[PDB]
Design a protein around this nucleic acid. Structure first.
Lengths: 297, 63, 439
DNA sequence: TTACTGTGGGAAAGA
DNA sequence: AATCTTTCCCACAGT
């Protein structure tokens, strides 16, 4: 099983040829808040699946054990895991416990979880690795920690349900760890200028490249990191033939416009429908921008 | 092992800040040329109408 | 200000059928340029379908407005007409007119459909790509909106012997059509009416063409469809499909099939047929506006003779579908920038929960609604909106219970929506669920 | 029938 | 260069 092949269910039609009562108490508890009871054995956990097809750790992971039951989770996990457990079982939404973990950002629980032979890699219904989620809700550490398994760095470039990678998602969200969460990935083992190539193939995922996303409605800190660190040809075009500038110009981020211009990013080249940054900015009525172009050359 | 339990929840927030920040700023910008927008449309969308009628007037003249 | 009221919304969300307005636009992903003065009509032809019964109600909301706005002192049947003009990256073309007139002869749940088979691009249009442009409005000079399709490539002529626009991709959509000797009138297109396949003269259907992998439910892989590969054709609307089939090349009514063909990716507008998996002599064919299997003659070992209407031209087609409804009487302005929600994501935990939506044409003037519960929406790009999951308690009540309350897993899944700060719902068709452990 | 108009095949011109 | 693509060129079968 990989992203490349999926499971498609559908009806059918053939052409002729010629005319002539269960509510798992353990679970609810585990779910609940505090109450730890019932046997926590091999039959206890591992085997039981409800209507969400979630295992005990699944619910344990669900740090949603609100009302607060702090440190017990990490422990109440370690329990069912050391009493045997498919530390890699998937729930309704194809979520491995370890995932719901990063979702709730229980970095500790994760730490053990992985140590128990858990695989971050295994993506969910959202064709999203664990690293995506880390990035998804920009929890710096959470990823800097997971970036130590050989197998994870492997799937560094792999792209989610919307054909986005690590940085791709990073550059897409702002903040202060971001610009570092990046330095991380690039250090870890990821090319800065990756367009989706290992996917140009079928799966309609593709186009842009990090810088695009930053550019697209600011994230300056990154566009500066990318066009300033080394690389990112500000003159790259997505499957719609767009230069970040354009994207930027389209959305209306004068801030980014100027930097890019200043750095020598072609304003000449046009998109797919023979349009260009101005005409775009102009088209969505972003005069501020329009004028900036005519204020140039 | 045995490290952390939360995660800098103040980055995530300082972030959801910056974002809500541009969302408001950008809600402005769109509310600005908003009429200019509906204008370029209001007209070109009717330029077809009077283009319709006169090319629809024909069905009336020839009878 | 015609903002939306929880109550009104329910009236909608409850009977979408008796309200909602769907309008879909099918079209080719590639068009053949025309030279000098000739006209080479696009084929298949871009056609617009008007779906839902809200199109009737939409009429009245104006019918009782032209008269109930007349007030003072045969031109009535005219102020309710559907006026629509489709056009290309027009720069010199007037912009063709689709019928939709009340005085049209017919010849399921489809209000009315029209096809634009006069469209064509000249060599005078020196653009590499171009997208359709449709404008809808009412006879009484009343606006509706203005749309545009996905990009369309321009080709000089279909190559005989970028690549996602010149090869058909494992998970893409196409149409299969048959034609006869230098003429049009006889054009048939693989389509599916009432849970069954056939071959329309009127319209054509978009079929996701899957690359079969291994094993009702089956394996599908990623990769350009190559001649001699098991292909599964699924209709994009209904869901229905056709049996396993091995797409194969054909030249002059002859099923070319040696070994040096599995090194050939199925190009656009080429002809080909689908031979069954078991009786590798049978080909998917239509014998007069109705499809059936067929045992075509054998000729050599590296070729095969087939029936005329057994070999068709395959071409990647795409489509767009717009769903919208006027929460409070038609609005002054039009809809035009109409949002299209792609996928819905979520990250973080409970108090840090966040919903990511993805799509195109996202205007900051939109507020996302979990069912009947609006949220502090955040516009980032016109391709994404983040929003905080509202507390379950405040979503469904003694009234909204049965509808927001999953009748199956007794959970709570509510229909997501993008709303215009002017009383208009843009139904994403997606749904947010709440894992509930009761009963 | 003569005049006119899409479409498909194929030669010739460029890339 | 060896081959593919683009621009011509034109016959067929309807209006």
């Amino acid at each position: 099983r990989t992203r490349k092949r999926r499971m498609i269910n559908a009806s059918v039609w053939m052409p002729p040829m010629e005319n002539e009562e269960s509510p798992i108490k353990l679970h609810t508890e585990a779910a609940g808040s505090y109450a730890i009871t019932e046997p926590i054995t091999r039959e206890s956990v591992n085997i039981i699946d409800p209507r969400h097809n979630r295992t005990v750790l699944h619910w344990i992971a669900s740090n949603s054990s609100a009302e607060k039951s702090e440190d017990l989770i990490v422990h109440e996990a370690k329990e069912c895991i050391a009493a045997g457990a498919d530390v890699n079982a998937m729930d309704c939404d194809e979520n491995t416990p370890l995932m719901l973990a990063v979702l709730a950002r229980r970095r500790r629980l994760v730490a053990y979880l992985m140590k128990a032979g858990a695989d971050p890699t295994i993506y969910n219904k959202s064709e999203r690795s664990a690293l995506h989620q880390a990035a998804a809700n920009r929890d710096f550490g959470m990823m800097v920690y997971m970036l130590n398994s050989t197998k994870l760095k492997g799937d560094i470039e792999e792209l989610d349900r919307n054909g986005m990678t690590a940085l791709m998602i990073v550059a897409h969200n702002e903040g202060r760890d971001q610009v570092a969460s990046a330095k991380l990935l690039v250090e870890k083992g990821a090319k800065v200028d990756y367009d989706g190539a290992a996917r140009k193939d079928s799966e309609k995922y593709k186009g842009r490249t990090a810088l695009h996303y930053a550019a697209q409605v600011s994230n300056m800190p990154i566009v500066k990191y990318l066009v300033g660190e080394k690389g990112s040809n500000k003159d790259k075009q997505d499957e719609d033939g767009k230069t970040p500038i354009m994207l930027a110009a389209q959305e209306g981020r004068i801030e980014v416009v100027m930097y890019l211009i200043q750095q020598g990013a072609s304003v000449e080249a046009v998109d797919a429908t023979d349009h260009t940054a101005r005409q775009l900015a102009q088209a969505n009525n972003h005069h501020n921008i329009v004028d900036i172009f005519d204020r140039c050359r | 092992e045995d490290e952390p339990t939360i995660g800098d929840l103040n980055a995530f927030h300082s972030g959801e800040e910056l974002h809500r920040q541009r969302s408001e700023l950008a809600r402005a910008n769109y509310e600005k040329a908003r009429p200019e927008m509906i204008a370029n449309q209001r007209a070109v969308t009717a330029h077809l109408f009077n283009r319709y009628t006169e090319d629809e007037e024909r069905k009336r003249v020839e009878q | 200000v015609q903002s939306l009221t929880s109550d009104r919304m329910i009236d909608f969300l409850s009977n979408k059928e008796k309200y909602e307005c769907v309008i879909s636009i099918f079209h080719a992903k590639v068009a053949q340029k025309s030279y000098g003065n000739e006209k080479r009509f696009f084929c298949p032809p871009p056609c617009i379908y008007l779906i839902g019964q809200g199109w009737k109600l939409k009429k009245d909301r104006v019918a009782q407005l032209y008269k109930t706005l007349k007030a003072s002192a045969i031109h009535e049947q005219q102020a309710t007409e559907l006026v629509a003009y489709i056009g290309i990256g027009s720069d010199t073309s007037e912009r063709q007119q689709l019928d939709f007139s009340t005085g049209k002869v017919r010849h399921p749940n489809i209000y009315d459909y029209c096809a634009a088979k006069t469209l064509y691009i000249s060599d005078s249009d020196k653009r590499k790509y171009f997208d359709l442009n449709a404008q809808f409005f009412y006879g009484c000079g009343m606006e509706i909106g203005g749309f545009v399709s996905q990009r369309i490539k321009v080709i000089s002529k279909p190559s005989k012997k970028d690549c996602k626009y010149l090869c058909i991709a494992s998970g893409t959509k196409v149409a299969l059509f048959n034609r006869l000797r230098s003429q049009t009138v006889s054009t048939r297109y693989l389509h599916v009416e009432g849970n069954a396949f056939h071959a329309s003269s009127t319209k054509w259907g978009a079929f996701t063409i899957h690359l079969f992998d291994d094993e009702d439910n089956f394996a599908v892989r990623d990769g350009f469809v190559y001649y001699g590969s098991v292909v599964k054709l699924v209709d994009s609307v209904t869901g229905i499909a056709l049996p396993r089939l091995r797409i194969r090349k054909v030249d002059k009514q002859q099923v070319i099939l040696d070994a040096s063909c599995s090194e050939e990716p199925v190009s656009q507008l080429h002809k080909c047929a689908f031979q069954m998996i078991d009786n590798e002599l049978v080909y998917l064919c239509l014998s007069h506006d109705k499809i059936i299997q067929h045992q075509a003659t054998a000729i050599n070992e590296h070729r095969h003779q087939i029936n005329d209407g057994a070999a068709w031209t395959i071409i990647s087609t795409d489509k767009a579908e717009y769903r919208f409804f006027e929460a409070m009487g038609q609005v002054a302005n039009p809809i035009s920038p109409c949002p299209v929600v792609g996928s819905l994501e979520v990250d973080g935990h409970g108090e840090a929960s966040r919903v990511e939506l993805h799509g195109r044409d996202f205007k900051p003037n939109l507020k996302v609604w979990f069912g009947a519960t609006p949220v502090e929406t955040t516009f980032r790009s016109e391709e994404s909106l983040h929003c905080s999951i509202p507390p379950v308690s405040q979503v469904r009540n003694e009234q909204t219970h049965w509808m927001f309350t999953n009748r199956t897993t007794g959970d709570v899944e509510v229909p997501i929506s993008l709303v215009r700060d002017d009383g208009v719902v843009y139904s994403s068709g997606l749904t947010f669920s709440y894992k509930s452990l009761e009963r």
